[PDB]
Amino acid sequence: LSLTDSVYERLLSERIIFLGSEVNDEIANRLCAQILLLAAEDASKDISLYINSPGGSISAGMAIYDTMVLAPCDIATYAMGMAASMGEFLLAAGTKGKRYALPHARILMHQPLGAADIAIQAEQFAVIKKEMFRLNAEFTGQPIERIEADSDRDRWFTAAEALEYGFVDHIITRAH
Amino acid sequence: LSLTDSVYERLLSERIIFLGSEVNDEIANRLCAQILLLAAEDASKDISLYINSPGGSISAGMAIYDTMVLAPCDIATYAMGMAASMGEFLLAAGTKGKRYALPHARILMHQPLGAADIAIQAEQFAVIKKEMFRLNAEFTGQPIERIEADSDRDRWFTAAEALEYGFVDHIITRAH
Amino acid sequence: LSLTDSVYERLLSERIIFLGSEVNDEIANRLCAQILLLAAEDASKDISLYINSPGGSISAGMAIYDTMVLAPCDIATYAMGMAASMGEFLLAAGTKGKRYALPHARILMHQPLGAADIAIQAEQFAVIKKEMFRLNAEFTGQPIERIEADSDRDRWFTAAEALEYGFVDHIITRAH
Amino acid sequence: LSLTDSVYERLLSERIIFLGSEVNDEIANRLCAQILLLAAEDASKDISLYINSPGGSISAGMAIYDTMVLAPCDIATYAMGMAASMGEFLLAAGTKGKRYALPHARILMHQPLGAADIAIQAEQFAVIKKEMFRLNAEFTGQPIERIEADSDRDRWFTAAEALEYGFVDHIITRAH
Amino acid sequence: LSLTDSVYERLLSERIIFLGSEVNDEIANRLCAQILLLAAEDASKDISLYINSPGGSISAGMAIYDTMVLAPCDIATYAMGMAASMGEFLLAAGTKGKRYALPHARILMHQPLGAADIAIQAEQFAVIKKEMFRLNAEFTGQPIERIEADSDRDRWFTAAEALEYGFVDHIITRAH
Amino acid sequence: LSLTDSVYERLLSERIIFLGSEVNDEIANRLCAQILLLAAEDASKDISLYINSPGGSISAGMAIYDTMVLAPCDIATYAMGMAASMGEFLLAAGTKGKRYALPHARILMHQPLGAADIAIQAEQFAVIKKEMFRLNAEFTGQPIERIEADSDRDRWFTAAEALEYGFVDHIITRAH
Amino acid sequence: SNPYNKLFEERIIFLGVQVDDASANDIMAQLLVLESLDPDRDITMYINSPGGGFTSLMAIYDTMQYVRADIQTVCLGQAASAAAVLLAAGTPGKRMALPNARVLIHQPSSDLEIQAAEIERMRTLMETTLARHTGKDAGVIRKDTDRDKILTAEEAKDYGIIDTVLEYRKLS
Amino acid sequence: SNPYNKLFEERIIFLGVQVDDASANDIMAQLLVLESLDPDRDITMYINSPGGGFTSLMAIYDTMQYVRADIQTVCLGQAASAAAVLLAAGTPGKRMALPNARVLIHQPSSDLEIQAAEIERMRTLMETTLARHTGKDAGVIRKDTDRDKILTAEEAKDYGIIDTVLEYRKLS
Amino acid sequence: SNPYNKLFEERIIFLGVQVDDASANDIMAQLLVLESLDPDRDITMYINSPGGGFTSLMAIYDTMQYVRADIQTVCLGQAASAAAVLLAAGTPGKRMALPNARVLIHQPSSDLEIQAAEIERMRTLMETTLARHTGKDAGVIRKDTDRDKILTAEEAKDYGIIDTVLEYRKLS
Amino acid sequence: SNPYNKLFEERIIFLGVQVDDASANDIMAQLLVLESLDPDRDITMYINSPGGGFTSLMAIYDTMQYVRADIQTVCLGQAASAAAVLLAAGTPGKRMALPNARVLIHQPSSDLEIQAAEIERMRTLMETTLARHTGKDAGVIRKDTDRDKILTAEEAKDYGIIDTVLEYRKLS
Amino acid sequence: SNPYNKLFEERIIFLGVQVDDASANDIMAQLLVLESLDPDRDITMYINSPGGGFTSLMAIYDTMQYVRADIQTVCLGQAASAAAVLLAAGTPGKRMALPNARVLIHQPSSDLEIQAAEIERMRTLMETTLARHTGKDAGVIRKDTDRDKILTAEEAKDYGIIDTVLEYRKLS
Structure with missing residues (x-):
């Protein structure tokens, strides 16, 4: 092991997971594995999810969202650092009443940045981007036309x- | 060990295996080894197989399929992320009644992409591609002529x- | 593990954390993780924070500050080596009466050094730099106009x- | 250790060895070491040998064959993936009645591919190639003139x- | 540890050492260390030495020979793979009556291949090469003039x- | 750990240290650390020092000599391989009556090979080279004028x- | 001197292989020198390139249609979906090709939506350019473009790209 | 100047080694310069290359059959399954080879099915090209191609590739 | 200009060091230029190379035996089993060598059986070529080849490679 | 032009630094051009090189002794055990050296026995070559060679290498 | 042509920066060309180099003192302990320097004892060379050398290195 690999393991025993890098094909698998392990260990507690991500992809974060919904526990998401186009979706994905934020957080409401199969690649990206704009309106409760206007302007937020x-x-x- | 190498070992004790990379000559050996270990530990339980693979080869996935069939347990395959030309075959390879899928899954029904021995390399690829098109029709129950038409169009699917x-x-x- | 990775783990059991590198997107996550682990282990003791940092960023140190404020323990910050534009903010962030300094410390009161999104990058940097100048005046008790004059001159200090x-x-x- | 280095060790306690790479000067030593360890642990059980090798050398596989013959146990060889010019010799080297094969195996009956000492290098390769053609006829029971005709044509086989x-x-x- | 580093340690407890690489300034030190450890653990048993070396130097193998002679145990040397100019000297260095060989071994009786200090480098190589030709005649019992004729011709042998x-x-x- | 890193640790418990590389600023620190550990563990036993070094520096070997003299134990130095200008000084540094040598050892009596501070670098090298020529005459008992004549000729020796x-x-x- | 200079002296533009943004400024500079020297003599172009970009393709297409001298395109070897447009953009009746030519027509080569939009735009532009010269409809060329179509010298004469296939001039 | 220029002055095309997509545009440019300068004088080509590609081979084969000047191929060294076609594509009666020549004939060099299809197509095209000049049948050449056939200067004269073997012109 | 041009003006072919597949096309091109310019004047070749390949050696050996001009080989330095054949392939009576020459004769330089077969074939071909000029038998040269034979200028005159050793022309 | 050409026009061979197998074919080619142009005028050589090989040293030593023009060696800078032989191989009475010259004489630069044998052979050959010109015995030079002997311009005049030391020609 | 050629036409040797073993053979070749062309006209040398070696320094120092033409050294920029010797080795009364010159004098640049011995030898040789021209004693220069002495144009005139400081020739 290492120094940073031992503190995370010791915090995993206390049902605490972290996300301090850009969610991609790698970090998403580890996050889902940790969530499933914490759900199989106990199904009557809460899982603290500290979110600090300067970016990431949507195809990988959707799997993390489905894993969070599949877990029968109560995910308590926190805004530790700054959420940039991928940390806000996981911050609002937690149960209503457990979504906290530090007083110096910066939530960036923005969409993710992104041969011969580019057509199907654009069609698959256009079917999950509208689905994200529906879950964002379902979680925050704001009208759907508000996030479609606040997403392209890169409007930064405070706590x-x-x-x-x-x-x-x-x-x-x-x-x- | 490491952080991602410890969570997988802790989940292995709970009969849970993962597949988060493109199946190749490497990941297939580890998958068969884990399946055989879980089958030798107990022969009266289920083995959860979370599938998230953006691709892979067929020669390596056939060994994983034979290993899954050889294990006397009941493989419960899940569609965690997206299946692309290699995750669908392992998702439908599980026992009927235990093949689940997350509500944001994307199953891509497609065939895999692929000196002086190119003739025998094409003959060996032409004898296992038709065998895959038979097992796919046997599992899904659809007519054989349906997958041969839905495979070349790169038709993406939803949950x-x-x-x-x-x-x-x-x-x-x-x-x- | 290693030699330097074992002494830090042995000191973590005695509620002692270190900061010997430039605070960035990496060290900040480890620091917050260690602080949260020490706060979850016991909520009635003190956490010694030895500060020796020749620099760092403000976006990462703000998260460390919020984590220190969130912990219900009493952070005892020390000036081991030299604080350069990022160690002073964490040195003064501790509780009043537990901020010590070695007789050969050098506190450098200075602000941190720092496509098409440079406008929002400057607006976000201009909203957290003035917030730092408010917390610095709240901690030290000096008038606000003093640090805005002592910050641009790179005025070094002694113990x-x-x-x-x-x-x-x-x-x-x-x-x- | 690692993830793939722990499952192999756990399977070694159950008398199960693997071969998932091209047999060379490295893998052969590990295979002989594992076989000798399993023979020294117990001399009244069976050793499952799962074979999946896309190639390899004959000088290294001959040592594995001699080690398998030296072990007083009963080697049970399996055709997990595909045998290519080196996995078939070890698959047929097991005791008669314990040589199994998965229904999607591909046995490739072929000979291996291979300064100033090239003469003795060709003489040493010509004295072990004819010895392999004798053991192959002794194991399979086919006439000797059959493998010398099926080896140069790269005739692939099925289960x-x-x-x-x-x-x-x-x-x-x-x-x- | 690793996979190949654990099987060797488990075999070391059973008084079994290996040599699967070219003996040099590195492998010789490990071999002497293992021999001395096995001699200090017990001085009334045998030490199995499986030899498979495609080459090596004489200055390093002489130390291994002196270490084997110094150990009060009974070294049982085996010809696992092929001995090439350095494995034969260690194979014949064992006690008379314990020097075995696998039926597919290839012993290569040959001498090893090998600024301003080249004169003393040739004088030191000429004083240990004649010493090797004396120990080879003492072990095998053949006349001294036989190995000096069979060494330059690169005469390969069988079991x-x-x-x-x-x-x-x-x-x-x-x-x- | 590793294979070669575990045998050395197991031999350290039996008061056995090794030197199989050129003594430099690295190996000397480890040697002094091992000697001090063995002296602090017990002060009434012997420490076997197997010497096999093809070279090294004198500034680093002097520290090893001072550490050997500081230890209250009885160092038993052996000539395992060959001593070249640095192993002889440590071989003769042991207590009189415990300096052994293998029958195929080669002791090379020779001196070690070796901006704007070259003057003080030559003055410091000229004050420790004459000190080595005094300790060599004190240990071996030969006249001082003998080693000053046998050192420049690179006169090799036998057991x-x-x-x-x-x-x-x-x-x-x-x-x- | 090199044979390329002796060819350019006869107003021969030998298009290199793998034309890109850097290899287009050299072929567009030769079309402007030969047009000012002698404006009624035709300019022949030997086509040999295994594909290329498209951002520089439209810069040479209109350049060949802007000079007053007639363009005689002779296909040498193959044309991987990029040189075929230049082969078909020549003067009608002067588009030749060797009997062993391989006129390939396949797919050419936020940053995901706008990229696909630009790809679709350049694709339909290429299809319109091909249908303007071959006298066909964009739908048929789009249906024949999705697959890796490999046209031979005899299959490209009746397709509309080339007008005549060159025969062997061997005297023995 | 370099001896290559003095050779090209005598209409000598010295084919380099390992001909590829980049080394073919230089030999195809020399066949078009010497054809326009003097159209009845023959052009000799010294063959020396240990193999090469095939996508550029068919671009030089028809080019040698398109010029009006006769091609005199003289094999120097060896020809590893690629230069042999150019050696046999010369003028009948002018295909020479040194007595120490090694005319090698072996196998030339979704992306797995179409690749094998293109390989089979280029293989049968090469076999047809070889059978057209050597007067043999494609089956015999295919039977002699699967193995690494090594033909000597004396074994290639009766095979149909070369017509005469050059003798030594030493006066002493 | 460089001294190499002034030497080539006097029909001097200075063979470089480590001749290979790429360094042979330059020496084979100079033997064809000097033969067409002046066919009765001899061509001298200064030999200096510490070995080389063999696939290109037989391409220069017959080339030296194909030109009508006589070859005068003068050994400068050494010849490591490859340049010795060219030194012995010169005109009888014109093969010279400096008194400090080192004529080395040693071993030259499925992919294991056919490789050994080709090595044996090239070895026996080299031995036959050496025995044809030196007037010896292939067995003696094969017996002297297995070991790293180092022949001096005086030991090579009676061996059959060189015919005369050059003396010093110093006037003081 | 470069000053090297203006020097070579006056028959000046400026030996470069670190002469090796590749830097010897250029100095051996200049000794053959100046010998054929004007055979009675002497050739001067400015020596400046911090050592080099030996396999190419004997190829230049006899070459300097083979030309008819007299060699006037002038040492510039130093000579690290390789250029000293060429400095002493010049014409007696014309071997000059600047007063700040450093004529260094030290050791020159199965594969262990034969390597030492070749090293001993080249060492004794160099010692014999040095004793032939300096008029000394091989034993004395071997005794002075084992150590890194550093000879000055005044210590090399009575040693036998150089014959006269050049003085300063300053008019003020 | 480049301005360096137009300067050399006026017998101007512009010493480059960081003179070493490779950059000294070019400045020593220009001192031998201008001396044979016109032996009474002086040669000026513009000094600009931030240090260098010493093994090649003594090869240029005596070379400047060997030619018959007078050397006029003009310091441009700085001289880091290596170019100062060449600046002081010029003709007395013709050693000029710009008013913003920085004449630096510092330390120049078994393998530990002999290395220190050679360093001490080259150091005392440099000090003797500097004291020979500046008219001082070696002790004073050694006392001023251990520290990184930085001499200005005005501090170097009375030191003995330069004799006159050039003034500005601006007409406005």
């Missing part, structure tokens, strides 16, 4: 703006 | 289309 | 000057 | 053809 | 020829 | 010549 927008439910300033 | 096509049997939206 | 400036509260010359 | 040719004795379709 | 030449004493075809 | 020269005291041909 106080994301609270009234519908992303998070609380702002932990001094808690346990 | 709802793959349910009525014959790939999976259930759509786990909220389960354990 | 005796930082004591009367408002950074630290004690100078440990011979203690335990 | 059903290798059963009637003399390579294997059974076709495990559904067993333990 | 049956090496038995009557004086290299080994038995041919293990079916033993324990 | 029998080094016995009568004054390097070693015994020739272990068959012992424990």
Whole structure:
């Protein structure tokens, strides 16, 4: 093992998972594996998910979302660092009432950036992008036409703006 | 060990195997080894097989299929991410009634992409490609002439289309 | 493990964390993970934070600050080596009365150094730089106009000057 | 250790060895070491040898054959993937009655591909190639003139053809 | 550890050492260390030495020979693969009556291949080459003038020829 | 760990240290650390020092000599392989009566090979080279003018010549 | 001197292999020199390239249609979906090809939506350009483009790309 | 100047070694310069290359059969299954070879099915080209091609590739 | 200009070092230029190369025996089993060598059986070529080839390779 | 033009630094051009090289002794055990050296026995060559060679290598 | 042509930067061409180099003192302990330097004892060479050499290196 590989294992025993890199074909598999392990260990507790991701892909984050929904536990998502086009979807994917955010968080509501099979690659990207815009409106409760206007402008948010927008439910300033 | 190498070992004790990369001459050996180990440990349980593969070869996946058939357990295959020309064959290879799929899965029904021995290389590829088109019709139950028409068009599928096509049997939206 | 990876783990059991490199997207995640682990292990003790950083970014150090504030323990920050534009903010972030400094410390009061999205990158950097200048005045107690004048001149400090400036509260010359 | 290095060790305790790469000066030493360890642990059981090799050398496989013959156990060789000019010799080297094959195996009956000492290098290769053609006729029972004609044509085989040719004795379709 | 590094350690507890690479300044140190460890653990047993070396140097093999002679145990040397100019000297270095050979061994009786200090380098090589030709005649019992004629011709041997030449004493075809 | 890193650790528990590489700024630190550990574990036993070094520096070997003299144990130095300008000094540094040598050892009595600070670099090399020529005469007992004549000629020695020269005291041909 | 200079002296533009953004500024500069020197003598172009880009293809297509001298395209070897457009853009009645020619027609070569949009635009532009000269309809060429169509010298004469196949001029 | 220029002045095309897509545009440019300069004088070609591609082979084969000047192929060294076709494509009666020549005939060099199809197509095309000049049947050449056939200067005269073997012109 | 051009003006072919497949097409092109310019004047060749290949050796050997001009081989330095054949292939009576020459004769340089077969074939061909000029038998040369034979200028005169050793022409 | 050409026009061979197998074919080609142009005018050689090989040293030594023009060696800088032989191989009475010259004489530069044998052979050959010109015995030169002997311009005049030391020709 | 040729036409030797073993054979070849062309006209040398070796420094120092033409050294920029010797080795009364010159004098650049011995030897040789021209004693220069002495154009005139400082010739 190593130094950073031992602290994560010790925190895994306390039902705490991390996401500190851009979600891709690699980190998504580890995240789903950790979530499934924590769900198989106990099915009556909560799983803290600290989110800090400067980016990522949607095809990999959709699997993480399905894994979070499949787990019978109660995912408590936190906004540790900054969410950029992929951390907000997982931050709002948690159960209503457990989506917290640190007072210096920056939620970036934005869509992800992205031979002869480019046609089917664009058709598959156009069928999951509209699905993300539906789940984002279902979670935050805002009208659907609001996120389609706030997504292209790269409108950055703060911990106080994301609270009234519908992303998070609380702002932990001094808690346990 | 490492972080991703410890969670997989801890999940192996709970009879859970993963496939998150393109099946090749390497991953296939590890998959068969894990399946044989789980079959030798106990011969009266189920082996969950989470499938997420953007591609792979057929010569290596055939060995995984034979290993799955050889194991006396009941393989429960899941569609975690997306199956592309190699994950669908292993998803439909499980026992009838245990082939599940996440609501945001994308099953790609497609054939795999692929000196002086090119003649025998084409003859060996032409004898296992028709065998795959027979097992695919035997598993899904669709007529044989349907997959030979849906394979060249790169027709992508969804979790709802793959349910009525014959790939999976259930759509786990909220389960354990 | 290794030699330097074992001493840090043995010191982690005694509630002692280190910071000996430039805080970036990597070290910040490990620091927050260690702080959260030490807070989940016990919520009635102190966490010694030895600071020695020749630089770093502000976007990553803000997360460390929020993690330190979130932990219900009492962070005891020390000035082991030299603080350069990122170690001073974490040195003054500790609780009042536990911010110590070695007699040969050098606190450098300075701001951090830092396509088509450069406008929003400058707007996001201009909203967290003024927030840092508010927390620095809140911690040290000096007027706000003092740090805005001492930050651009790269004014270096000593253990005796930082004591009367408002950074630290004690100078440990011979203690335990 | 690692993920693939732990499953092999756990299977070694159950007297199961693998061969998933081209036999060379490296893999042959590990195979002989594992066989000798399994023979020294117990001399009254069987050693399952799963064969999947796309090639290899004869000078290294001869040592594996001598090690298999030296072990007083009963080697049970299986055709997991495909045997190409080196896996067939080890598949037929097992005891008569324990040489199985998966229903999708491809046995390739072929000879291996291969300064100033090229003369002795050709003389040493010409004295072990005829010895292989004798053991192949002794194992399969076919006349000696049959393999010398089927070896140069690169005649590929199937699980059903290798059963009637003399390579294997059974076709495990559904067993333990 | 690893896969090949664990089987060797498990075989070391059973007093079994291996040599599967060209003896050089590295492998010789490990071999002498293993021999000394096995001699310090017990001084009333035998040490099996499986020899498979396609070459090596004489300056490093002389140390292995002195270490084998220093150990008060009874070294049982085997001809697993092929001995090429360095494995024969260690194969005949064992005690008379314990030098076995596999039926497909190839013993190559040959001498090893090999600024301003080339004169002393040739004088030191000329004083240990004649010493090797004396120990080879002392072990095999053949006249001294026979090996000086069979060494330059690169005369290869078989398991049956090496038995009557004086290299080994038995041919293990079916033993324990 | 590894294979060669485990045998050395197992031999360290039996008070046996090795030197199989050129003594430099790296190996010297490990040797002094091992000697100090063996001296702190027990101060009433002997420490076997097997010497096989084709070269090295004098500035690093002087520290090893001082560490050997500082240890209150009785260092038993052996000539396993060949000593070249640095192994002889450590071979004769042991206590009188415990300096053994294998019958095929080659002791090379020779001095080691070796901006704007070259003057002080030559003055420091000229003050430790004469000190080595004093300790060599004190250990072997030969007149001082003998080694100054035998050092520049690169006069190689054998196990029998080094016995009568004054390097070693015994020739272990068959012992424990 | 090199044979390329002796060919250019006879107003011969030998298109290199794998034409790209850097290899197009040299063929577009030769079409402007031979047009100012002698404006009524035709310019022949020997086609030999296993494909290329498209951003520089449309820069040479209109350039061949802008000069006053007639273009005589002679296909040497093959044309992998890029040189076929230049072979068909020549003067009608002067588009020749050797009997062992391989006129290949296949698919040419946020950054995912706009990329697919530009690919579709360049594809339909290439299909319109091919249908303008071959006298066919864009639908048929699009149906024959999705597959890796390999046209021979005899199969390309009745297709509309070339007009005549060159015969062997051997005296023995 | 280099001796290559002095050879080209005598209409000598010295084919380099390992002819490929890049080395074919230079030999196809020399066949078009010497044909326009002097159209009745023959062009000799010294063959020396240890194999090559095939996509550019058919571009030079028909080019040698398109010029009006007769081709005199003289084999120097060897010809590894690619230069033998050019050696046999010369003028009948002018195909020479040194007595130490090695005319080698072996196998030339979804992406697995179409690749094998193109390989079979180029193989049968090469066999037809060889049988057209040697006067044999494609079956015999296919039977002699599967193995690494090594033909000597004396074994290639009665085979149909070369017509005469050059003798030594030493005066002493 | 370089001294190589001034030497070639006097019909001097200075063979480079480590002759291979690429360095043989340049020496075979100079033997064809000097033969067409002046066919009765001899051509001298200064031999200096520490070995080389064999696939290109037989392409230069017969080329030296094909030109009408006589070859005068002068050995400069050494000849490591490859340049010795060219030194012995010169005109009888004109094969010279400096008194400090080192005429080396050693071994020259499924893919294991056919490789050994080709090696044996090229070895016996080289031995036959050496025995044809030196007037010896192939057995003696094969017996002297297995070992790394090092022949001096005085030991090569009576061996059959060279005919005369050049003396010093110093006037003081 | 470069000053090297203007020097070669005056029959000046400026030996480069670190002479090897590749840098010897250029100095051996200049000794054959100046000998055929003007055979009675002397050829001067400015020596400047910090050592080199020996396999090419004996190829230039006899070459300097084979030409009819007298060699005037002038040492510029140093000579590390390889250029000293060429400095001493010049014409007696014309071997000059600057007063700040460093004539170095040290050791020159199965594969272990034959390598040492060849090293001993080349060493004794170099010693014999040095003793032939300096008029000394091989034993004395071998005794002075084992150590890194550094000879100055004044210590090399009475040693036998050089005959006269050049003085400064400054007019002020 | 390049301005370096137009300068050399006026007998101007522009010494490059970082003179070494390879950059000295070019400056030593220009001193021998201009000396044979016109032996009474002076040769000027513009000094600009941030240091260099010493093994080639003594080869140019005596070369500047061997030619009959007078050397006029003009310092341009700086001289890091190597070009200062050449600046001081010029003709007395013709050693000029721009007013912004930096004449640096610092330390120049078994294998440990002999290396230090050679370093001490070259150091004392450089100090003797500097004291011979500057008219000082070796002790004072050795005392001023151990430290990184930085001499200006005005501090080098009374030191003995340069004799006059060039003024600005601006007409406005």
